mmCIF file of C-alpha atoms in Angstrom:
data_model
loop_
_atom_site.group_PDB
_atom_site.id
_atom_site.type_symbol
_atom_site.label_atom_id
_atom_site.label_comp_id
_atom_site.label_asym_id
_atom_site.label_seq_id
_atom_site.Cartn_x
_atom_site.Cartn_y
_atom_site.Cartn_z
ATOM 1 C CA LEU A 1 -33.271 -47.294 0.928
ATOM 2 C CA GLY A 2 -29.326 -47.944 2.009
ATOM 3 C CA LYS A 3 -28.151 -46.044 -0.691
ATOM 4 C CA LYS A 4 -29.485 -43.125 1.307
ATOM 5 C CA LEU A 5 -28.172 -44.128 4.543
ATOM 6 C CA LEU A 6 -24.865 -43.869 2.477
ATOM 7 C CA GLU A 7 -25.898 -40.516 0.822
ATOM 8 C CA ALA A 8 -27.294 -39.359 4.210
ATOM 9 C CA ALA A 9 -24.417 -40.369 6.262
ATOM 10 C CA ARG A 10 -21.564 -38.949 4.033
ATOM 11 C CA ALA A 11 -23.952 -35.606 4.292
ATOM 12 C CA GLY A 12 -23.044 -35.677 7.531
ATOM 13 C CA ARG A 13 -26.912 -34.968 8.210
ATOM 14 C CA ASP A 14 -27.140 -36.893 11.812
ATOM 15 C CA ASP A 15 -31.027 -36.336 11.746
ATOM 16 C CA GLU A 16 -31.059 -38.151 8.293
ATOM 17 C CA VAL A 17 -29.690 -40.928 9.679
ATOM 18 C CA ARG A 18 -31.449 -41.534 12.228
ATOM 19 C CA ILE A 19 -34.987 -41.331 10.249
ATOM 20 C CA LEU A 20 -33.776 -43.915 7.761
ATOM 21 C CA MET A 21 -32.383 -46.088 10.524
ATOM 22 C CA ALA A 22 -35.560 -46.044 12.677
ATOM 23 C CA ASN A 23 -37.469 -46.969 9.246
ATOM 24 C CA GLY A 24 -35.100 -49.963 8.990
ATOM 25 C CA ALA A 25 -32.276 -49.462 7.028
ATOM 26 C CA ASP A 26 -29.515 -51.518 6.192
ATOM 27 C CA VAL A 27 -26.711 -50.183 8.311
ATOM 28 C CA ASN A 28 -23.987 -52.100 6.344
ATOM 29 C CA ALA A 29 -25.185 -51.016 3.670
ATOM 30 C CA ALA A 30 -22.374 -50.585 0.333
ATOM 31 C CA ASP A 31 -21.565 -48.457 -2.403
ATOM 32 C CA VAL A 32 -19.628 -49.880 -5.650
ATOM 33 C CA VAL A 33 -16.102 -49.523 -3.694
ATOM 34 C CA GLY A 34 -16.837 -51.189 -0.794
ATOM 35 C CA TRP A 35 -17.551 -47.975 1.578
ATOM 36 C CA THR A 36 -20.104 -48.671 4.235
ATOM 37 C CA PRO A 37 -21.811 -45.774 5.847
ATOM 38 C CA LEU A 38 -19.110 -46.315 8.765
ATOM 39 C CA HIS A 39 -16.690 -45.784 6.059
ATOM 40 C CA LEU A 40 -17.970 -42.280 4.380
ATOM 41 C CA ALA A 41 -18.677 -40.762 8.105
ATOM 42 C CA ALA A 42 -14.859 -41.567 9.789
ATOM 43 C CA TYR A 43 -13.553 -40.476 6.235
ATOM 44 C CA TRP A 44 -15.702 -37.163 6.362
ATOM 45 C CA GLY A 45 -14.678 -37.084 10.675
ATOM 46 C CA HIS A 46 -18.740 -37.126 11.064
ATOM 47 C CA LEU A 47 -18.063 -38.356 14.313
ATOM 48 C CA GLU A 48 -21.856 -38.218 15.329
ATOM 49 C CA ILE A 49 -23.280 -40.169 12.862
ATOM 50 C CA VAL A 50 -20.070 -42.795 13.693
ATOM 51 C CA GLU A 51 -22.114 -43.275 17.297
ATOM 52 C CA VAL A 52 -24.961 -43.564 15.963
ATOM 53 C CA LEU A 53 -24.284 -46.090 13.626
ATOM 54 C CA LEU A 54 -21.951 -48.247 15.996
ATOM 55 C CA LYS A 55 -24.897 -48.124 18.210
ATOM 56 C CA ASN A 56 -27.417 -49.572 15.711
ATOM 57 C CA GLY A 57 -24.991 -52.592 15.335
ATOM 58 C CA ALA A 58 -22.813 -51.427 12.338
ATOM 59 C CA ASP A 59 -19.980 -53.561 11.482
ATOM 60 C CA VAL A 60 -17.116 -51.914 13.090
ATOM 61 C CA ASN A 61 -14.363 -53.670 10.748
ATOM 62 C CA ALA A 62 -16.434 -53.900 7.432
ATOM 63 C CA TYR A 63 -14.101 -53.386 4.754
ATOM 64 C CA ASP A 64 -13.901 -51.903 1.061
ATOM 65 C CA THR A 65 -12.684 -54.091 -2.163
ATOM 66 C CA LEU A 66 -8.918 -53.147 -0.909
ATOM 67 C CA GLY A 67 -9.073 -54.398 2.489
ATOM 68 C CA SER A 68 -9.398 -50.974 4.196
ATOM 69 C CA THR A 69 -11.636 -50.388 6.973
ATOM 70 C CA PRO A 70 -12.655 -47.732 8.668
ATOM 71 C CA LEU A 71 -10.531 -47.215 11.091
ATOM 72 C CA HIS A 72 -7.765 -47.089 8.372
ATOM 73 C CA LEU A 73 -9.632 -43.841 7.056
ATOM 74 C CA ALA A 74 -10.174 -42.222 10.579
ATOM 75 C CA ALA A 75 -6.559 -42.878 11.400
ATOM 76 C CA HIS A 76 -5.405 -41.522 8.075
ATOM 77 C CA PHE A 77 -7.036 -38.429 8.243
ATOM 78 C CA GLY A 78 -6.448 -37.867 11.714
ATOM 79 C CA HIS A 79 -9.859 -37.843 13.167
ATOM 80 C CA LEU A 80 -8.896 -38.827 16.793
ATOM 81 C CA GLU A 81 -11.996 -39.301 18.397
ATOM 82 C CA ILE A 82 -13.335 -41.301 15.970
ATOM 83 C CA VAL A 83 -10.284 -43.335 15.991
ATOM 84 C CA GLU A 84 -11.280 -44.220 19.887
ATOM 85 C CA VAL A 85 -14.388 -44.770 19.684
ATOM 86 C CA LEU A 86 -13.974 -47.086 16.854
ATOM 87 C CA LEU A 87 -11.467 -48.550 19.263
ATOM 88 C CA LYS A 88 -13.795 -49.029 22.002
ATOM 89 C CA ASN A 89 -16.411 -50.371 20.281
ATOM 90 C CA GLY A 90 -14.354 -53.480 18.477
ATOM 91 C CA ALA A 91 -12.280 -51.490 15.881
ATOM 92 C CA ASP A 92 -9.775 -54.282 14.730
ATOM 93 C CA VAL A 93 -6.486 -51.857 15.392
ATOM 94 C CA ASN A 94 -4.321 -54.036 13.409
ATOM 95 C CA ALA A 95 -6.551 -54.339 10.619
ATOM 96 C CA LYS A 96 -4.824 -55.034 7.284
ATOM 97 C CA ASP A 97 -5.308 -54.041 3.728
ATOM 98 C CA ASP A 98 -4.620 -55.772 0.678
ATOM 99 C CA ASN A 99 -1.604 -53.757 0.523
ATOM 100 C CA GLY A 100 -0.426 -54.719 4.122
ATOM 101 C CA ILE A 101 -1.106 -51.307 5.394
ATOM 102 C CA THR A 102 -2.258 -51.059 8.968
ATOM 103 C CA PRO A 103 -4.266 -47.877 10.658
ATOM 104 C CA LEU A 104 -0.605 -47.198 12.686
ATOM 105 C CA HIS A 105 1.152 -47.147 9.254
ATOM 106 C CA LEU A 106 -1.108 -44.448 7.703
ATOM 107 C CA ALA A 107 -1.332 -42.080 10.620
ATOM 108 C CA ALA A 108 2.264 -42.447 11.081
ATOM 109 C CA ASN A 109 3.109 -41.314 7.210
ATOM 110 C CA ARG A 110 0.624 -38.763 7.696
ATOM 111 C CA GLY A 111 2.141 -37.103 11.244
ATOM 112 C CA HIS A 112 -1.196 -37.934 13.467
ATOM 113 C CA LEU A 113 1.125 -38.242 16.434
ATOM 114 C CA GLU A 114 -2.264 -38.585 19.306
ATOM 115 C CA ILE A 115 -3.957 -41.021 16.540
ATOM 116 C CA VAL A 116 -0.359 -43.141 16.971
ATOM 117 C CA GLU A 117 -0.207 -42.782 20.613
ATOM 118 C CA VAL A 118 -3.813 -44.101 21.220
ATOM 119 C CA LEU A 119 -3.441 -47.065 18.207
ATOM 120 C CA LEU A 120 -0.270 -47.940 20.220
ATOM 121 C CA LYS A 121 -2.351 -48.165 23.560
ATOM 122 C CA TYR A 122 -5.043 -50.111 22.148
ATOM 123 C CA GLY A 123 -2.300 -52.242 21.102
ATOM 124 C CA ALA A 124 -0.589 -52.228 17.690
ATOM 125 C CA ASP A 125 2.202 -54.450 16.357
ATOM 126 C CA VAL A 126 4.574 -51.627 15.574
ATOM 127 C CA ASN A 127 6.863 -54.214 13.843
ATOM 128 C CA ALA A 128 3.832 -54.910 11.221
ATOM 129 C CA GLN A 129 5.312 -54.868 8.016
ATOM 130 C CA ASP A 130 3.977 -53.786 4.367
ATOM 131 C CA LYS A 131 3.999 -55.517 1.356
ATOM 132 C CA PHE A 132 7.455 -53.515 1.339
ATOM 133 C CA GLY A 133 8.503 -54.677 4.590
ATOM 134 C CA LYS A 134 8.131 -50.792 5.997
ATOM 135 C CA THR A 135 7.181 -50.517 9.683
ATOM 136 C CA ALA A 136 5.564 -47.397 10.848
ATOM 137 C CA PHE A 137 9.105 -46.487 12.178
ATOM 138 C CA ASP A 138 10.284 -47.162 8.705
ATOM 139 C CA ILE A 139 8.094 -44.204 7.605
ATOM 140 C CA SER A 140 9.295 -41.880 10.585
ATOM 141 C CA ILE A 141 13.152 -41.923 9.866
ATOM 142 C CA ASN A 142 11.804 -41.755 5.917
ATOM 143 C CA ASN A 143 9.451 -38.833 6.691
ATOM 144 C CA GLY A 144 12.261 -37.086 8.836
ATOM 145 C CA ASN A 145 9.797 -36.950 11.732
ATOM 146 C CA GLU A 146 11.922 -37.305 15.422
ATOM 147 C CA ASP A 147 9.151 -36.642 17.529
ATOM 148 C CA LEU A 148 7.644 -39.989 16.052
ATOM 149 C CA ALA A 149 10.465 -42.077 15.523
ATOM 150 C CA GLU A 150 10.835 -41.617 19.555
ATOM 151 C CA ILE A 151 7.538 -42.142 20.388
ATOM 152 C CA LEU A 152 7.806 -45.299 17.977
ATOM 153 C CA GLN A 153 10.510 -46.458 19.408
ATOM 154 C CA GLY B 1 -6.272 -43.761 -20.427
ATOM 155 C CA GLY B 2 -5.001 -44.570 -23.997
ATOM 156 C CA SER B 3 -1.921 -42.514 -25.978
ATOM 157 C CA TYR B 4 -2.191 -40.707 -29.057
ATOM 158 C CA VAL B 5 1.339 -42.680 -30.723
ATOM 159 C CA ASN B 6 1.163 -40.782 -34.200
ATOM 160 C CA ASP B 7 -0.828 -39.915 -37.536
ATOM 161 C CA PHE B 8 -1.886 -42.232 -40.496
ATOM 162 C CA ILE B 9 -4.302 -41.962 -43.667
ATOM 163 C CA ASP B 10 -7.643 -43.421 -43.908
ATOM 164 C CA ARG B 11 -9.025 -42.925 -47.237
ATOM 165 C CA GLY B 12 -6.527 -40.179 -48.084
ATOM 166 C CA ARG B 13 -7.426 -38.296 -44.844
ATOM 167 C CA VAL B 14 -4.995 -37.757 -41.881
ATOM 168 C CA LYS B 15 -6.314 -39.368 -38.792
ATOM 169 C CA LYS B 16 -4.993 -40.480 -34.995
ATOM 170 C CA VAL B 17 -3.655 -43.510 -34.102
ATOM 171 C CA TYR B 18 -4.576 -44.459 -30.646
ATOM 172 C CA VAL B 19 -2.851 -47.260 -28.367
ATOM 173 C CA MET B 20 -5.496 -47.844 -25.141
ATOM 174 C CA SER B 21 -6.546 -51.282 -23.155
ATOM 175 C CA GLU B 22 -9.109 -53.146 -24.891
ATOM 176 C CA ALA B 23 -12.033 -52.562 -22.561
ATOM 177 C CA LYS B 24 -11.829 -56.217 -20.920
ATOM 178 C CA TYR B 25 -9.009 -54.979 -19.251
ATOM 179 C CA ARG B 26 -9.223 -51.944 -17.703
ATOM 180 C CA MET B 27 -12.507 -52.263 -15.937
ATOM 181 C CA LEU B 28 -12.060 -53.499 -12.935
ATOM 182 C CA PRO B 29 -9.714 -52.871 -9.755
ATOM 183 C CA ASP B 30 -7.905 -56.281 -9.719
ATOM 184 C CA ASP B 31 -7.044 -55.937 -13.533
ATOM 185 C CA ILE B 32 -4.266 -53.553 -12.459
ATOM 186 C CA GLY B 33 -2.255 -56.489 -11.512
ATOM 187 C CA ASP B 34 -3.094 -58.013 -14.564
ATOM 188 C CA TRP B 35 -0.246 -55.547 -16.582
ATOM 189 C CA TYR B 36 3.575 -56.184 -16.920
ATOM 190 C CA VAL B 37 6.505 -53.773 -17.358
ATOM 191 C CA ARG B 38 9.708 -55.230 -17.901
ATOM 192 C CA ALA B 39 12.736 -54.782 -16.112
ATOM 193 C CA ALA B 40 16.090 -54.386 -17.482
ATOM 194 C CA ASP B 41 17.529 -57.915 -16.548
ATOM 195 C CA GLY B 42 14.109 -58.828 -19.308
ATOM 196 C CA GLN B 43 12.182 -60.062 -16.393
ATOM 197 C CA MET B 44 8.063 -59.497 -16.451
ATOM 198 C CA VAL B 45 6.910 -57.583 -13.041
ATOM 199 C CA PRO B 46 3.659 -57.548 -12.604
ATOM 200 C CA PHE B 47 2.324 -53.906 -11.245
ATOM 201 C CA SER B 48 1.043 -55.439 -7.984
ATOM 202 C CA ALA B 49 5.024 -56.156 -7.195
ATOM 203 C CA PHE B 50 5.580 -52.086 -6.872
#
């Protein structure tokens, strides 16, 4: 029944999560890659479910087999609201995956300016270096995004 | 993924020759870092470095 929550969380079926939830389903269940229902909903921008999962004690910092957290996914695909909801619920803003990439790193490269603003607000080692010594800034200059480079100053 | 190098003859008939990792080494995410490429200076660099 933990798989169902995984499938129901991705399928974005809010109600399905509720039932399975109440019927006592493992909120921190996990597929072969390390995705938790929180991982799925965050990835496919399913806000209402990200909330309904955090409420039921779902781990806000559960990571996958590569050190990636739900915050990494939400910040990466620009799901702003989730980025904050996760942050207000304890999401480690400076989580680093196996490659030493942080949520700011991702959102930066993908041009999610507001997500960057928020991530900085909740704190974020602007000088964090990935496995290549690249900081969210190096990215902005590389990508040629001036709006971002400025703000990341 | 495997690579079709060239053909050979098996009991009088032309057939293919394939190169691919033995199953054991292309089964898990971390096995990626077990493969090494060679640099100009001759050093072996693991995939995980780049």
